[PDB]
Amino acid sequence: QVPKLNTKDLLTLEELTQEEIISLIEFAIYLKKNKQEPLLQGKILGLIFDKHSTRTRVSFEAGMVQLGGHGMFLNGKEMQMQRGETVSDTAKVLSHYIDGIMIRTFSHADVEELAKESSIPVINGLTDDHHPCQALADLMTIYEETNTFKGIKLAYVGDGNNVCHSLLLASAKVGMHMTVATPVGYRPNEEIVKKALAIAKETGAEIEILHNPELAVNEADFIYTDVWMSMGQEGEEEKYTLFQPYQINKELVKHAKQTYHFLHCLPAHREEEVTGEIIDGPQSIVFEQAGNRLHAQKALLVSLFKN
Amino acid sequence: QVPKLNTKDLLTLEELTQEEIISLIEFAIYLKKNKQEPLLQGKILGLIFDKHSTRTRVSFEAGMVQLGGHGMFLNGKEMQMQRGETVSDTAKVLSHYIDGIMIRTFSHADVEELAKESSIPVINGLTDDHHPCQALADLMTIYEETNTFKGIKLAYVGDGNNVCHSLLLASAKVGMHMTVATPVGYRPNEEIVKKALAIAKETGAEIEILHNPELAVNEADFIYTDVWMSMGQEGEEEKYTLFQPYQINKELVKHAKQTYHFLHCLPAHREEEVTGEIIDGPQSIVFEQAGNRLHAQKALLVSLFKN
Amino acid sequence: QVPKLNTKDLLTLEELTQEEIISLIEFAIYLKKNKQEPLLQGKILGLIFDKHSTRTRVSFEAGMVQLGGHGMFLNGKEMQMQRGETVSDTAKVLSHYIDGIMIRTFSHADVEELAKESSIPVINGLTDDHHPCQALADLMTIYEETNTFKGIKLAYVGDGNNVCHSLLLASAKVGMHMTVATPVGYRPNEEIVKKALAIAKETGAEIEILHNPELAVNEADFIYTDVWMSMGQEGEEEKYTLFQPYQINKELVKHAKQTYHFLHCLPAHREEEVTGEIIDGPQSIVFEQAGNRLHAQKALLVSLFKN
Ligand SMILES: CCC[C@H](N)C(=O)O
Ligand SMILES: CCC[C@H](N)C(=O)O
Ligand SMILES: CCC[C@H](N)C(=O)O
Ligand SMILES: [Cl-]
Ligand SMILES: [Cl-]
Ligand SMILES: [Cl-]
Ligand SMILES: [Cl-]
Ligand SMILES: [Cl-]
Structure with missing residues (x-):
């Protein structure tokens, strides 16, 4: 049907x-x-x-x-x-x-x-x-693992960009808890945050926008990131410096659940937004994510x- | 068959x-x-x-x-x-x-x-x-409205370019009356004009090449234009001023039949060769023309x- | 099968x-x-x-x-x-x-x-x-003419490039005799030459890498060339001077069999690596070669x- x-x-x-x-x-x-x-x-x-x-x-x-x-x-x-x-x-x-x-x-x-x-x-x-x-496929990928969105926590750490926006709306729609951590000056669009929050009021989703990445990933089931310079964006050399504390690495992920899985929309730049150790490691599902x-x-x- | x-x-x-x-x-x-x-x-x-x-x-x-x-x-x-x-x-x-x-x-x-x-x-x-x-599709579009080429008048106003040439030959082949108005220095190619006139001798088509646009559109059933700078021509910026009197606008089309229809091969540049008022107005058929x-x-x- | x-x-x-x-x-x-x-x-x-x-x-x-x-x-x-x-x-x-x-x-x-x-x-x-x-198709083209690779001689005259490499390995695989003539400084890669010679030991192919084009084409059944500047190359202007003696022309092909046929992978530059007289002449099979x-x-x- x-x-x-x-x-x-x-x-x-x-x-x-x-x-x-x-x-x-x-x-x-x-x-x-x-x-x-x-x-x-x-x-x-x-x-x-x-x-x-x-x-x-x-x-x-x-x-x-x-x-x-x-x-x-x-x-x-x-x-x-x-x-x-x-x-x-x-x-x-x-x-x-x-x-x-x-x-x-x-x-x-x-x-x-x-x-x-x-x-x-x-x-x-x-x-x-x-x-x-992308976010629709990501929901599918999450659902294949969990069989539910109730009580699931997704943490996005990175730039407040198009992908972040779509995950915020997707999570709010299905009632999934989502946290965002970005550097100061790179928050997701405030109008899109407001729309997600409004949707979340009806579905039970908890949406939080933060600056501290360790707090954001605390007890997460999924950690998601994306590149620091998107196709639409003009370069700031100072941007790369501000983003260093937001890299997905061993030190960051230990704050999430031991059973967490790593997501990335791709393409990825190893040793920028994520280390090879994470994206190529046992908790990564980025290729099945892409397949979906x-x-x-x-x-x-x-x-x-x-x- | x-x-x-x-x-x-x-x-x-x-x-x-x-x-x-x-x-x-x-x-x-x-x-x-x-x-x-x-x-x-x-x-x-x-x-x-x-x-x-x-x-x-x-x-x-x-x-x-x-x-x-x-x-x-x-x-x-x-x-x-x-x-x-x-x-x-x-x-x-x-x-x-x-x-x-x-x-x-x-x-x-x-x-x-x-x-x-x-x-x-x-x-x-x-x-x-x-x-x-393009001209073959344009004949089809005309025929769908008129059910005949006999006694129909097509007026092309614009540059003596590729689309003008094809309409001249098409009109002559089916016996339709066609007038052209171009600025001085921008007439259709004379060898193509001669070919069209020779074809028109056999078919009854009246083909007339003119400069004054109001005379060209007099009692027309269709008014056709095209862009002033074709893909073959980017250097020639001067054209834009020379061609202003050739714009298809309310003042021009009132000289045609009240039942006339507007044709344009597309793409169009509103407020250059045609006004929004004309191409978006009730006598325009440019999207059915493109569909054909x-x-x-x-x-x-x-x-x-x-x- | x-x-x-x-x-x-x-x-x-x-x-x-x-x-x-x-x-x-x-x-x-x-x-x-x-x-x-x-x-x-x-x-x-x-x-x-x-x-x-x-x-x-x-x-x-x-x-x-x-x-x-x-x-x-x-x-x-x-x-x-x-x-x-x-x-x-x-x-x-x-x-x-x-x-x-x-x-x-x-x-x-x-x-x-x-x-x-x-x-x-x-x-x-x-x-x-x-x-x-390309070389697989070339072998097919040769075999359609000869019905065998035994006792057949292919001469490639030109730059020691990607097409030369593939012909060397192809010829050695099927046991065909192959000669190459290039200018000094433009020999085929020596490691590729070694691999071809090793293969040829097992199959009976005679592979020779030479500088003298007249010697290379002597008694050849096929003459092959390619452009002097390949897509991957930004070679010196001195290259053209060194290549002057390597054009495939009437004077060169008279040293091959009267029954020889001309091959070129295409695209070709007439009057550079090969004259019009050869590539458009009665011994050329380049368009059947491309078809294959x-x-x-x-x-x-x-x-x-x-x-
Ligand atoms: C799939 C690419 C996603 C990235 N944020 C970009 O817009 O470049
Ligand atoms: C369909 C494009 C027609 C125009 N005369 C051009 O040649 O640019
Ligand atoms: C098919 C082109 C072959 C040529 N040697 C090149 O690489 O440009
Ligand atoms: Cl962007
Ligand atoms: Cl994977
Ligand atoms: Cl329409
Ligand atoms: Cl190359
Ligand atoms: Cl041929």
Whole structure:
């Protein structure tokens, strides 16, 4: 049974209810376990990219192909948007040709406009502000270990960026406890924190934004990090210095549960945000986490294309 | 049935008779209305692009996929032609691997050479001189409104460029009246004008090349424009002032029929060649026009591949 | 019978026995002659390219499509390797999504690492050091003419580059006599020469590395050359001066058999490494040679995917 969703698009996870998120995760687990069937026969997903990608690009197109459809890679440097065509005109023409769009870009507003002006589904494959498909797969990865979100503690330590934003919203939706530790000056966006906190009031989630990483990871079941300079960001040399106390290393993780697992969206820079010892060690699940991008997105695609 | 064509390639529309063009339009209209069948099962169309594209790139690959075949995007920057491999050599090797080629580039002579040296069909997806697949779709769009080309008047106002050339030839082939207005120094190519006039002698088409835009649009059924600086032309900034009197705006279109429709190949630059008021207003059909790139091209592909 | 191979990967041809190479060539000839069947139904081959390509890029994707599978083009400029992601991390995530990888790049070591860290097959589609699929297709092309490798003489005249290396190892594997002439300072890698000589001891191949092109081509059945400046090279301007005596032209080829045939991997630069008179003349088989990239690689793909 394909999950029914009351949304055309997936831009932040705010669009989904708790029950819809759980249904997507269960359907992804089903698709992971069972023989491939051509549920999206003949369907074409456009894949617009304005930023680098390995996992998102390959997993989306492979997912479509496994479902009997097609992915069409559209480098943003080749589209007439480069030459000043509006996002609205783009949306309207693509709706005549293909069945959905996944877009990865800088401006979140541009993805909102694309969705608004498109008659086909639009999926955010990462913006400066949100990476929802990553957080959906991460929820699946956590659920495969725990079989529940109740009483689970996730600690994110790092920069208050797009990935942090999506994990905050994801955790709040499913009722999972989440702490964030960032350096001063690099907190997650306050409006997104407020939205997560509001959601958490209804679900029982405890969301805390902190500066002390040792306190944040205390008794955590999962520790998550990400790179210190994201694709959207301008360099500060002083940033690297401020982030040193936020590295995920042996000294930090000993404050979490002995049974904790390490998560990272990838790509990773060993000896910056995380040491080789941690990411390549026995508590790391980053490759299975990455694998689940495929399954979680196939569930999302089948549900959105069924509308 | 599938239209029979007496050409391997489609470079300018000169290669087609009136009857063949009408047959293509009727077949496109059939394909637009009827269930997709895999008429090109297993066929691979190579898509060589040396210039930006949204509509041509997406519509050709979607068309192929919808007919059970494949489109293979080939950025010109990645091909060995960028490192000096000849067009002839490229033609000969691609003919061993794939079933047809669509090419968008600068030099029309290059596309002529590709067709001459290739044993597979070659389609011009725009050159500096011709954009024949656009004009074929534009004929289809007109025909859907009028159900005839007899007594219809098309007015093109703008630069004497590739799209103007293809519309001149298309109009002449089907017997439609066409007027052109361009600024002094920007007339369509005189050899192409002569070809169109020669074709028009046989078909009853009245082709008129003018400078005054108000005279050109008088009692028109359709007003068509395009950008002032084509991809073949970035240096030429002077144009922007010269072309201001050629803008499609409320003051201009009142001289056409009250029932006129506005066409534009896209991409468009609002407040340059056309105002938002016109392109976004109730007489604009530019998005249906763009949608018909898909269907007109599918008809062409099935016919060329039938040979 | 699909050939059984005792290797997961194809990086240099060293991985293959003489019997395996012959079996591959026979299978390629069969595939060339016989109707397409979907032997690789559903399979996805990633095609990672850091360098320009026409033949390799098109032939590998067409081959997959013709076998009922898919080729996914991945420009190296768009992958997170560009932003510092390790080859190992890349290998581990791709293995979750797709079924094999073909990679064209600079560093042969990177391709070795990709193969080591990947659970799926890896194929070298050219590196600075080896171009094994080219030499496999070249052996097929020779065998189609001669029906044997015994008593056949191949002469390569040019730069001691990646293609020279692969021809050396190919010739030694099948027992064909091969001579090389290069300028002073541009010999093939001495360790590769040693490996070829060792293989040749077992097979009866005579391999000679020389400076005098007229001596090298004496009584040759085949003459082969390639460009003087490969994609990986930023060689001195003095190089062109040293290469003047090494052009393949009428004066040189008269020293070979009257029945010789000319080979070139392509792309070629007429009037540099070879004259138009030779490459377009009656002894040239370069376009059949390029065509055989398709068939030889389809044989390899099927065999690797089976294993
Ligand atoms: C997947 C990349 C995530 C990272 N925060 C970035 O935006 O660069
Ligand atoms: C579809 C683009 C048409 C325009 N005349 C150009 O050549 O840029
Ligand atoms: C197929 C190209 C071969 C040439 N030696 C190069 O590496 O550029
Ligand atoms: Cl960012
Ligand atoms: Cl893992
Ligand atoms: Cl419209
Ligand atoms: Cl090189
Ligand atoms: Cl040939």
